Design a protein around this ligand. Sequence first.
Ligand SMILES: Cc1cc2nc3c(=O)[nH]c(=O)nc-3n(C[C@H](O)[C@H](O)[C@H](O)COP(=O)(O)O)c2cc1C
Ligand SMILES: Cc1cc2nc3c(=O)[nH]c(=O)nc-3n(C[C@H](O)[C@H](O)[C@H](O)COP(=O)(O)O)c2cc1C
Lengths: 175, 176
Amino acid sequence: DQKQFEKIRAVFDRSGVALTLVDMSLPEQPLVLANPPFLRMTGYTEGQILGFNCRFLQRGDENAQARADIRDALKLGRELQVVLRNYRANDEPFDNLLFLHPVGGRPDAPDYFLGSQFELGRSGNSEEAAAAGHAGYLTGELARIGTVAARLEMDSRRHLAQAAAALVRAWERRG
Amino acid sequence: MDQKQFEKIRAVFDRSGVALTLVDMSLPEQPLVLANPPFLRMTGYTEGQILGFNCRFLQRGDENAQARADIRDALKLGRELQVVLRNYRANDEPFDNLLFLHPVGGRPDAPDYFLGSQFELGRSGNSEEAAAAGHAGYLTGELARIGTVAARLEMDSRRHLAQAAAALVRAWERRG
Ligand SMILES: Cc1cc2nc3c(=O)[nH]c(=O)nc-3n(C[C@H](O)[C@H](O)[C@H](O)COP(=O)(O)O)c2cc1C
Ligand SMILES: Cc1cc2nc3c(=O)[nH]c(=O)nc-3n(C[C@H](O)[C@H](O)[C@H](O)COP(=O)(O)O)c2cc1C
């Protein structure tokens, strides 16, 4: 459609978490939407990145296993949450808890894919809390875009919160 | 304060996944004006029974004195609170209730309504801290559509709330 994509651009602007949309009917898998808390999180500008692949937040090859899961989830049209080593436009390193969620299309061939980025080590004291809170918030945005139904939202919010914290517990566990 | 917002407060309440209530602050009795199905399902009531009543009906009297004082303070000041209350369902079954209060409408120290969101504790067979924080983050996004919070402070209030909620279950866990 086209009414839907416009509602998506709306949610993206007024959103309090980082949000990226990429087109899946294009082989490079390009960004068609990056939102202000994302641009401000990475340092880039909506024009110097829109049309490319969010791979650019990576240097070299630091995320072999995580990139494998990503490529499989994109192929399958499945949600994924995964920690990546990223780098801002000023090449300062940060860990990115990435949330992936298929948008539009058919269940095995979505039109777009949504990514939500949760920077680690920003918070006051609890990284589990901050990540779950991110997850909980993101669940609400996803419901707005109309990817999730208005019933499956009380479990989905807690699943995502559990998964996000379970991942944070792993991230810290690497001593 | 104004309207157009009240049609979308209803819109939010009806489809939301968290327990949500709204209390009219222009009356000193402070009655429920909206209770959504997750709140109804959690407490064992139907909607037509509780509209018009003050939410203290979920209590057993003389129990949450410290909490109730903080709640009265929040309501008077017109600012937010998060507390834990001993509550009971319509069949007298006890549950613990992490309650999020948030001012809506009006002027700074005289809101038109207060919103409540109830998180039942101990029903998460995994991580209570993460479950409570997931709720807070989801509530924060919910409060952003009703117009109270929006833009930059919609991001900071979410991360604040997620932090506060976890700290509360951490305390809750401490005292047994
Ligand atoms: C919607 C979406 C958002 C993404 N966000 C990020 C990101 O923030 N950081 C990152 O390193 N990779 C991100 N990726 C992953 C890359 O775009 C890429 O698909 C991934 O690295 C696997 O690709 P590869 O074939 O280059 O190994 C995102 C992917 C999608 C589809
Ligand atoms: C919006 C809103 C929601 C509330 N939800 C609850 C609740 O779920 N459980 C509860 O015990 N009290 C709840 N309360 C608080 C009671 O209505 C009352 O304010 C509290 O018991 C403290 O006041 P009191 O000492 O006069 O009873 C809520 C209050 C407001 C404004």
